[PDB]
């Protein structure tokens, strides 16, 4: 049936699409755990430029 | 005297002798399985003893059936043998099983098996008789004085592109 | 007493596939009733039938549980005085059954002083148990979050590779030991491979002891057997375990694997019949012929019966109508996953997946109740903080979260427990725990008191006291270490 | 009839020819619609029960043989593009090569809409092919 066809296509589809997905938050939770570091690192380059 | 049970319980029959009295009027090999196939289906387990004069048929037969195989293997029979008695139907191999193939591989000049035979049988068995060893090595040296240590093919030098896949 | 329609001669009148069509000349006996092909035929296996629809005053159709092949027309057929009759007593246990009720394992006559007919009404209103009481089985996972009812139904989702043939077994011995009541396994559509194995398998626990005791009986309406089979073997194994409960007194424990195969077999039998089919698929009669099964599976006055059903969803959809009736009469739910299995947790059982009807505080403890849903809550909180220490690190947890953490970490570690059964295998002896040594323990553990041992002094122990010895086997053995790594 | 004058070309004169048909879907079309009348129940989607045997018998006959060749190129219907329908489904086994058709890949301009990833031959191997 052509009705169910379409609706397995459509669920798979929005399968692969979370993955591609879960794949960039993967990529940029790293960016930003490595990231974070500023935040120790950081509001006394500025003191006398305020 | 002892009686065996099965893996459900029930007792087996442990009168061996009447069948290997069979195995060992076999001609050829072949035939020989056959009489190991009609014991398990009448309920008798065969024992190290009845492997063992299966070994003997082997070696001591000319050929697996009166027409020829196209790749008969003694040892190969022996070994499918051994695993069976060994892997399959719990129990173990002992002196006389290996020393059979090692008569095998002296008589048939596979002295390569030879060496792994004799490592098996020193390391699980007391020692290889030296008899067999010293013929082992002996067919091992006409190898070499001949030259036929190695099947030319792979002595023969190839390349990148000088080697036919097929 | 005897009914008048034992003896009764017929003819049969028709043949259609496993339907059979028998002409009674001083009337066609009551439905259900069985009946025995006594025409010789040259078959291998005899022939009996089992009425079940009335075409007229004279001539009845019934439902072959053999091959019907070799049967000829107005070959003579005789009633056997009664519906199927099944062996019931001490005499069967450790002993294999089919839906006749014929000892199908070559050990012998099984010597029954009595039989019962495979088809009972339920227990009465009036029969029922004044109040609903706790199952103990023994492991601390199923006693604390999904406690059994006694005389509930408990759906144990889950496949192969999960051990639930162990975790079958292991209920099995502890029903016997605890409670001291005994077992009746009832394998509808089971692969004969897998049947086979379990026989093996209960031989080497000791549950069937041959020379002994045995402590389980089992009923095989495999799938090689028609359907007319199949959708009787669980019937059956139910009249057995219904001996026990009333003339006994006991509590039982009713396996069956599966109760979806039980509606496949009773689904194509009407099929057979020419009955229309509902939705999907299933006969019309899916609601009834489940609850003529079910019913008969609670806990009187006299006894109870304890049913632990393998449940099978089709295609991944649970709101198919097939789980979808059966989810109405589960009291119990109990999920096996393979992930936990391989975390090396044992019993791999989810905690957060399942479920119990009697986790209320009118039927358990008030305690009982307060612990396992705190166990719940800090399970709960585990999963976020995992998400959170994999996100923006564990040194980013507060004070709080951290000692959350260890506690989780260390109630999944004090989950898993060793069964008696596998002590051959894995070596390492079984624990019993108690219900009351098990909400302490874990009463303990969330409060914190124990919150200087080890973590891994909780896995594969049983009991807060086996907590403590373990400790001191690897305080005392580390002693040891550090003398020789402080020397050398 | 148009395979019985092909089968003569074959036998008879031991030539090679070739055969087009179009469309066989129709056969088993009009077989269907007669079949309610027949006496017969319909099966799954509502063909005929006799779907698979009759066009069996059918592509069994378009076939060489040892007198003479039959090179047969057949057009298939396939009901809604619905390739999972029991009638284009039960020829796919009668066939040596399958060149299906997508309607997604006409709609952008490419002729012939083949979808090389459906499509299959036998003769794709190493031995027969360079």
Same mark, same amino acid.
């Given at each position: 049936?052509?009705?169910?066809?379409?609706?397995?296509?459509?669920?798979?589809?929005?399968?692969?699409?979370?993955?591609?997905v879960?794949?960039?938050?993967?990529?940029?939770?790293?960016?930003?755990?490595?990231?974070?570091?500023?935040?120790?690192?950081?509001?006394?380059?500025?003191?006398?430029?305020? | 005297?002892?009686?065996?049970?099965?893996?459900?319980?029930?007792?087996?029959?442990?009168?061996?002798?009447?069948?290997?009295?069979?195995?060992?009027?076999?001609?050829?090999?072949?035939?020989?399985?056959?009489?190991?196939?009609?014991?398990?289906?009448?309920?008798? *387990?065969?024992?190290?003893?009845?492997?063992?004069?299966?070994?003997?048929?082997?070696?001591?037969?000319?050929?697996?059936?009166?027409?020829?195989?196209?790749?008969?293997?003694?040892?190969?029979?022996?070994?499918?043998?051994?695993?069976?008695?060994?892997?399959?139907?719990?129990?173990?191999?002992?002196?006389?099983?290996?020393?059979?193939?090692?008569?095998?591989?002296?008589?048939?000049?596979?002295?390569?098996?030879?060496?792994?035979?004799q490592?098996?049988?020193?390391?699980?068995?007391?020692?290889? *008789?030296?008899?067999?060893?010293?013929?082992?090595?002996?067919?091992?040296?006409?190898?070499?004085?001949?030259?036929?240590?190695? *099947?030319?093919?792979?002595?023969?030098?190839?390349?990148?592109?000088?080697?036919?896949?097929? | 007493?005897?009914?008048?329609?034992?003896?009764?001669?017929?003819?049969?009148?028709?043949?259609?596939?496993?339907?059979?069509?028998?002409?009674?000349?001083?009337?066609?006996?009551?439905?259900?009733?069985?009946?025995?092909?006594?025409?010789?035929?040259?078959?291998?296996?005899?022939?009996?039938?089992?009425?079940?629809?009335?075409?007229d005053?004279?001539?009845?159709?019934?439902?072959?549980?053999?091959?019907?092949?070799?049967?000829?027309?107005?070959?003579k057929?005789?009633?056997?005085?009664?519906?199927?009759?099944?062996?019931?007593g001490?005499?069967?246990?450790?002993?294999?059954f089919?839906?006749?009720?014929?000892?199908?394992?070559?050990?012998?006559?099984?010597?029954?002083?009595?039989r019962?007919?495979?088809?009972?009404?339920?227990?009465?209103?009036?029969?029922?148990?004044?109040?609903?009481?706790?199952?103990?089985?023994?492991?601390?996972?199923?006693?604390?979050?999904?406690?059994?009812?006694?005389?509930?139904?408990?759906?144990?989702?889950?496949?192969?590779?999960?051990?639930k043939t162990?975790?079958?077994?292991?209920?099995?011995?502890n029903?016997?030991?605890?409670?001291?009541?005994?077992?009746?396994?009832?394998?509808?559509?089971?692969?004969?491979?897998?049947?086979?194995?379990?026989?093996?398998?209960?031989?080497?626990?000791?549950?069937?002891?041959?020379?002994?005791?045995?402590?389980?009986?089992?009923?095989?309406?495999?799938?090689?057997?028609?359907?007319?089979?199949?959708?009787?073997?669980?019937?059956?194994?139910?009249?057995?375990?219904?001996?026990?409960?009333?003339?006994?007194?006991?509590?039982?424990?009713?396996?069956?694997?599966?109760?979806?195969?039980?509606?496949?077999?009773?689904?194509?039998?009407?099929?057979?019949?020419?009955?229309?089919?509902?939705?999907?698929?299933?006969?019309?009669?899916?609601?009834?012929?489940?609850?003529?099964?079910?019913?008969?599976?609670?806990?009187?006055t006299?006894?109870?019966?304890?049913?632990?059903?393998?449940?099978?969803?089709?295609?991944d959809?649970?709101?198919?109508?097939?789980?979808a009736?059966?989810?109405?009469?589960?009291?119990?739910?109990?999920?096996?996953?393979?992930?936990?299995?391989?975390?090396?947790?044992?019993?791999?059982?989810?905690?957060?997946?399942?479920?119990?009807?009697?986790?209320?505080?009118?039927?358990?403890?008030?305690?009982?109740?307060?612990?396992?849903?705190?166990?719940?809550?800090?399970?709960?909180?585990?999963?976020?903080?995992?998400?959170?220490?994999a996100?923006?690190?564990?040194?980013?947890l507060?004070?709080?979260?951290?000692?959350?953490?260890?506690?989780?970490?260390?109630?999944?570690?004090?989950?898993?427990?060793?069964?008696?059964?596998?002590?051959?295998?894995?070596?390492?002896?079984?624990?019993?725990?108690?219900?009351?040594?098990?909400?302490?323990?874990?009463?303990?553990?969330?409060?914190?008191?124990?919150?200087?041992?080890?973590?891994?002094?909780?896995?594969?122990?049983?009991?807060?006291?086996?907590?403590?010895?373990?400790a001191?086997?690897?305080?005392?053995?580390?002693?040891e270490?550090?003398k020789?790594?402080?020397?050398?």
């Amino acid at each position: 049936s052509g009705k169910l066809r379409l609706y397995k296509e459509k669920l798979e589809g929005y399968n692969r699409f979370y993955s591609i997905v879960k794949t960039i938050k993967m990529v940029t939770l790293a960016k930003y755990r490595a990231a974070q570091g500023r935040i120790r690192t950081r509001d006394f380059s500025l003191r006398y430029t305020e | 005297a002892a009686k065996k049970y099965d893996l459900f319980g029930y007792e087996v029959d442990t009168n061996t002798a009447p069948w290997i009295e069979k195995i060992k009027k076999c001609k050829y090999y072949d035939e020989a399985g056959e009489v190991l196939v009609n014991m398990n289906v009448s309920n008798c *387990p065969p024992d190290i003893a009845t492997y063992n004069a299966t070994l003997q048929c082997i070696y001591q037969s000319p050929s697996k059936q009166s027409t020829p195989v196209d790749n008969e293997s003694k040892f190969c029979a022996m070994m499918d043998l051994l695993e069976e008695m060994q892997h399959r139907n719990r129990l173990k191999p002992n002196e006389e099983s290996w020393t059979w193939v090692m008569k095998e591989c002296v008589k048939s000049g596979q002295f390569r098996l030879g060496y792994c035979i004799q490592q098996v049988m020193e390391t699980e068995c007391k020692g290889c *008789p030296a008899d067999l060893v010293k013929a082992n090595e002996a067919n091992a040296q006409k190898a070499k004085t001949e030259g036929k240590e190695h *099947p030319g093919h792979l002595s023969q030098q190839a390349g990148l592109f000088d080697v036919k896949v097929e | 007493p005897v009914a008048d329609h034992k003896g009764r001669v017929g003819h049969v009148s028709q043949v259609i596939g496993a339907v059979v069509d028998v002409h009674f000349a001083d009337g066609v006996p009551p439905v259900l009733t069985a009946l025995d092909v006594v025409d010789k035929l040259g078959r291998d296996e005899p022939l009996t039938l089992e009425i079940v629809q009335h075409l007229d005053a004279h001539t009845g159709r019934c439902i072959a549980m053999q091959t019907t092949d070799l049967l000829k027309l107005k070959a003579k057929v005789v009633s056997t005085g009664g519906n199927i009759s099944v062996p019931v007593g001490r005499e069967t246990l450790g002993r294999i059954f089919n839906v006749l009720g014929d000892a199908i394992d070559q050990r012998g006559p099984v010597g029954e002083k009595l039989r019962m007919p495979i088809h009972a009404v339920a227990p009465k209103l009036a029969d029922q148990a004044a109040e609903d009481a706790v199952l103990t089985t023994g492991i601390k996972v199923i006693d604390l979050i999904l406690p059994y009812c006694k005389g509930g139904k408990i759906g144990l989702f889950g496949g192969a590779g999960v051990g639930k043939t162990v975790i079958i077994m292991e209920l099995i011995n502890n029903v016997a030991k605890g409670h001291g009541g005994f077992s009746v396994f009832a394998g509808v559509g089971e692969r004969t491979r897998e049947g086979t194995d379990l026989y093996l398998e209960m031989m080497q626990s000791k549950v069937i002891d041959l020379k002994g005791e045995s402590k389980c009986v089992l009923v095989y309406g495999q799938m090689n057997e028609p359907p007319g089979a199949r959708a009787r073997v669980a019937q059956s194994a139910l009249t057995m375990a219904e001996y026990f409960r009333d003339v006994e007194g006991q509590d039982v424990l009713l396996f069956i694997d599966n109760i979806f195969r039980f509606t496949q077999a009773n689904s194509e039998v009407s099929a057979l019949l020419g009955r229309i089919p509902a939705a999907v698929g299933y006969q019309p009669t899916l609601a009834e012929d489940l609850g003529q099964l079910q019913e008969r599976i609670t806990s009187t006055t006299k006894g109870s019966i304890t049913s632990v059903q393998a449940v099978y969803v089709p295609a991944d959809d649970i709101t198919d109508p097939a789980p979808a009736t059966t989810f109405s009469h589960l009291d119990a739910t109990t999920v096996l996953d393979r992930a936990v299995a391989e975390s090396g947790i044992y019993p791999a059982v989810n905690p957060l997946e399942c479920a119990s009807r009697i986790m209320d505080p009118d039927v358990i403890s008030v305690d009982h109740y307060n612990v396992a849903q705190d166990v719940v809550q800090m399970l709960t909180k585990y999963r976020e903080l995992q998400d959170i220490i994999a996100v923006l690190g564990i040194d980013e947890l507060s004070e709080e979260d951290k000692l959350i953490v260890d506690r989780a970490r260390k109630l999944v570690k004090f989950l898993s427990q060793p069964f008696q059964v596998a002590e051959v295998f894995t070596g390492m002896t079984g624990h019993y725990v108690q219900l009351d040594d098990t909400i302490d323990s874990f009463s303990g553990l969330l409060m914190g008191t124990y919150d200087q041992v080890p973590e891994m002094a909780f896995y594969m122990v049983g009991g807060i006291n086996s907590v403590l010895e373990k400790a001191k086997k690897m305080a005392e053995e580390a002693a040891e270490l550090e003398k020789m790594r402080r020397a050398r």
